[PDB]
């Protein structure tokens, strides 16, 4: 990924809507032996997302690096994924496993900061979280820890969803501090939203 700063007198750079947040995690040239030598190709693990908390995971195969990055962008574009939150935190401590990828995603009080390793830091920095506390146990990789983090975010659910599963009136599903954090986060959603209307 070099020589991107450019000014063209051509038709268009085609800049348009959906200015999302896009992170390229790792690139390892992938070789293939054929008759008389090696054929080098490229893999780019592409994370895309918006600051609401919708995450994509794309996996680009091409024999050029920006081609593989662009194919990962289109593949994560094809496949988004909804993550439920509280304010800008996570709901409750989970462990995700993608066959060797263990990631523990635990919430924290706000202000602490996204503390995670670089793959999980990528998937969570694209997402709508600002203050959680994760760790990547096992598998020491990028692909399995990204995919394990997304499986960990599939083990998430709303407080309300849990209440619904059990047919119980909330209050009765959460404890009270987390309901107060719901009041804080929806209150600042009201403040920034009504400042957004004017």
């Amino acid at each position: 990924r070099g020589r991107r700063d450019d000014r063209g007198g051509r038709g268009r750079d085609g800049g348009d809507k959906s200015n999302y947040i896009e992170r390229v995690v790792s690139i390892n040239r992938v070789s293939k032996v054929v008759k008389g030598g090696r054929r080098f190709s490229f893999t780019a693990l592409v994370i895309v997302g918006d600051g609401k908390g919708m995450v994509g995971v794309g996996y680009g195969k091409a024999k050029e690096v920006p081609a593989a990055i662009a194919k990962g962008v289109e593949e994560a574009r094809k496949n988004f994924f909804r993550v439920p939150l509280i304010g800008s935190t996570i709901t409750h401590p989970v462990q995700g496993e993608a066959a060797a990828g263990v990631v523990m995603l635990r919430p924290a009080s706000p202000g602490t900061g996204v503390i995670a390793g670089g793959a999980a830091r990528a998937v969570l920095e694209c997402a709508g979280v600002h203050d959680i506390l994760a760790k990547s146990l096992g598998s020491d990789n990028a692909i399995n820890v990204v995919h394990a983090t997304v499986a960990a975010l599939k083990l998430l659910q709303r407080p309300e969803e849990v209440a619904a599963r059990r047919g119980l009136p909330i209050e009765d599903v959460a404890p009270a501090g987390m309901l107060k954090a719901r009041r804080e986060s929806e209150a600042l959603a009201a403040a920034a939203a009504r400042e957004g209307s004017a």
Binding site: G2, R3, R10, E64
Partner: protein, 210 residues
Amino acid sequence: MGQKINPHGFRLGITTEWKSRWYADKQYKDYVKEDVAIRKLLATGLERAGIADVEIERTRDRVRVDIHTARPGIVIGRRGTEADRIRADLEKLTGKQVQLNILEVKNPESQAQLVAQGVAEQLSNRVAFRRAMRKAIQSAMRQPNVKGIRVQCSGRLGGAEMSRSEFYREGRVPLHTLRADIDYGLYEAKTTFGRIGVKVWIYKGDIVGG
């Protein structure tokens, strides 16, 4: 390795015309010598200018030197000042008198020689070579009407020690078909690390037009 014959020399009987045209018995070696020194004399300032084709028709010892380029305005500066200087030096180097016709190609991105010009002159200018190859292409495919597009760049690419050849294309470029109308142009970039020889194949169409 790739033992690929120059396709403008592989279809020079069938589709592509000769560049130089006369008849000569016992005057032929002299006409060859004048043809060579004329093309060396039209190498430098016209390769600054954007030269593509240098045809020399030759009637009863006058001469007619015709050049197809991509900017009438650098070849013809002030009228007669830039034209009649190289024209007059062609009149003095040859022992003859020169009728220099200068004409523009309707699309510079259509000619394979001029694509090799713009690519190699970008590649001497420290740009990214894969970015350069992509730039020349795509835009060329649409420009006028091309079917083939082969850009091979060998040499010290990016200043590296290994001489890596690259091979990008789009569409149909059949070399073994003789009704191909393929334009071919190889021009050689001059970096400080060395020379990056650029080959460009451009397949315009199936049309014989016999």
